Amino acid sequence: SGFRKMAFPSGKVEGCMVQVTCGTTTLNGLWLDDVVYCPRHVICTSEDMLNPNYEDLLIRKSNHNFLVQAGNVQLRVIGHSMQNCVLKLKVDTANPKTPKYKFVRIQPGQTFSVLACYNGSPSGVYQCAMRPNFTIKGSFLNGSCGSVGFNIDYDCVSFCYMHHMELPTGVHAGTDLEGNFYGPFVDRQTAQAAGTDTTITVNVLAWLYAAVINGDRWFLNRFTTTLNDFNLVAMKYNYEPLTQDHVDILGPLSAQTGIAVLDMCASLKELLQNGMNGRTILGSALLEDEFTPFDVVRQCSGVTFQ
Amino acid sequence: SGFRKMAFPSGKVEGCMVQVTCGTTTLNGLWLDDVVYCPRHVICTSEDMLNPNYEDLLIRKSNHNFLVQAGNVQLRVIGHSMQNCVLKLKVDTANPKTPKYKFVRIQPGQTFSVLACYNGSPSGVYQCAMRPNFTIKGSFLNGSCGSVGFNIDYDCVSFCYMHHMELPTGVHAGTDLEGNFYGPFVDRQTAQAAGTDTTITVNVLAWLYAAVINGDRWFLNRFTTTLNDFNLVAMKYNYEPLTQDHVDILGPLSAQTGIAVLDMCASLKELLQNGMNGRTILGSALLEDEFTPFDVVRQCSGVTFQ
Numbered sequence A, B: 001s002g003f004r005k006m007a008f009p010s011g012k013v014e015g016c017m018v019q020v021t022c023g024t025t026t027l028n029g030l031w032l033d034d035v036v037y038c039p040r041h042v043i044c045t046s047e048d049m050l051n052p053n054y055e056d057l058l059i060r061k062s063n064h065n066f067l068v069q070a071g072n073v074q075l076r077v078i079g080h081s082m083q084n085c086v087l088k089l090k091v092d093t094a095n096p097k098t099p100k101y102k103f104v105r106i107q108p109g110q111t112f113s114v115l116a117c118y119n120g121s122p123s124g125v126y127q128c129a130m131r132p133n134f135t136i137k138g139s140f141l142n143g144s145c146g147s148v149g150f151n152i153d154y155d156c157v158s159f160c161y162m163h164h165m166e167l168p169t170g171v172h173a174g175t176d177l178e179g180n181f182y183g184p185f186v187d188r189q190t191a192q193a194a195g196t197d198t199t200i201t202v203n204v205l206a207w208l209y210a211a212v213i214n215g216d217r218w219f220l221n222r223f224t225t226t227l228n229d230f231n232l233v234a235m236k237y238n239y240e241p242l243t244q245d246h247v248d249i250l251g252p253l254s255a256q257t258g259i260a261v262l263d264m265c266a267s268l269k270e271l272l273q274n275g276m277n278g279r280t281i282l283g284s285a286l287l288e289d290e291f292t293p294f295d296v297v298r299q300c301s302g303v304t305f306q
Ligand SMILES: CCN(CC)c1cccc(NC(C)=O)c1
Pocket: A041, A049, A140, A141, A142, A143, A144, A145, A164, A165, A166, A167, A187, A188, A189, A190
């Protein structure tokens, strides 16, 4: 027992990180098969970032201008192309440590692990969620662009995120591995504001189920509610509206705890209205929203879902 | 910027995890060079765990009774010995993925990463601290015994923890890799109670420095204090006493923030006396104590310490 924010083991992704240098800009790439993926802003000088025209900047770049280093080995670049906001560098050597993998574009509320990297070298791993405003709240310093986010199912790495930049408010924006930004952001050094960071209700519910399973039960109340009554409350507190799709994926936790989803919603409603009164749940004094229902069911062995 | 609870990349340790079966008990081992390390309770039946005599139980075990599996490959056991509460199984094959490594026994307050594993297969990674009562607050389900905790310095893995059991209160106990328990615990299925779980003051201070660096400054107050005045307050709130050794390792953060260590102590004292008044620090509504000063300096690039 116990319940922790837990990342995926990172070794499968570690073996894919490389350093990419163009001119005087160095960042991280992702080497899969014979392609290296990286943010296209590798081609920009810091001054170019103010108002880049990427197509124009790319005219002055050849294969031999992209330096790709995998530990000590230099990789030979034999082609390059731009796909949305990523560059794809064709190299002459397939990565021997390529894992089984897919590229997936996740929805807001979904969680994933980030392998923060500098100069192609992995430094740390942590779990993130895609916020409803399409930012993530990461930890990223100079040189971490091109660090990736992923999920693992058995032996298959699903890559869902590549880090591109930090907003003025200190939250993070990036792309899928086809180079499409999450949210409205662009790869330009011009101030860009995030929308409302609402709480991922379905995740808070999952985590409340996790707390019950671990014996944190003080917050369980005597009430139930309806989806509409609950949503009236959610909206007030900047919680995402709960739908029947959300209710459906909470089914295994309801069954384990014997606590009906709507009963748990009524407990959550009272927490929102009364606060926690200085108490904790799973060692937190706030309601945690970066565990999905699927995440919980992975750390609560006695939840039946498969 | 941003600040996250971040584990070490786990790939170096992933390549060392094996499954160890003895009779009908299966758990995890750590394969380094030609030795596999695992909890000695692998030899016990569930009934044996009530009151095991390990020396006596071991008389009835031979090399061929320990099944060691590395993925599909079965490893041949050519010797075994008990060292404190661990078994060392000599195998005929050195692990080809052995990293540079050391065994270290950590102090209370030190942090490390756990690679939670089942059947020799890594499932998740998270950061832990050794609590002042010599427990950890982990996430461990059936079959996770022999999962390890570690730190990485550049290319060298320092192993500091091996998981052995869960106390009745749902917290975790284990050994160093020489098989000595942290704290007073024993590998027997008899109820064992933990002492006071005090807060690691020096870590809370480090994390307050991390918050300042990231622009969370609301809690900075107008006061300073002394080590004795502060410690009078610490004791009341079940905080570890702060020493000049602690003050010394906070030196780089004081220098960066220009906030004297004692000034930060005075801010902490006011948080203890007044609470957080519904505010957050680094997205927490409580004072976080599982980041060391060394941990902070790794995610706050503009802290000068080397
Ligand atoms: C838009 C400008 N760019 C891209 C070069 C930018 C802005 C802020 C921060 C970072 N770097 C990280 C690691 O987020 C990168």
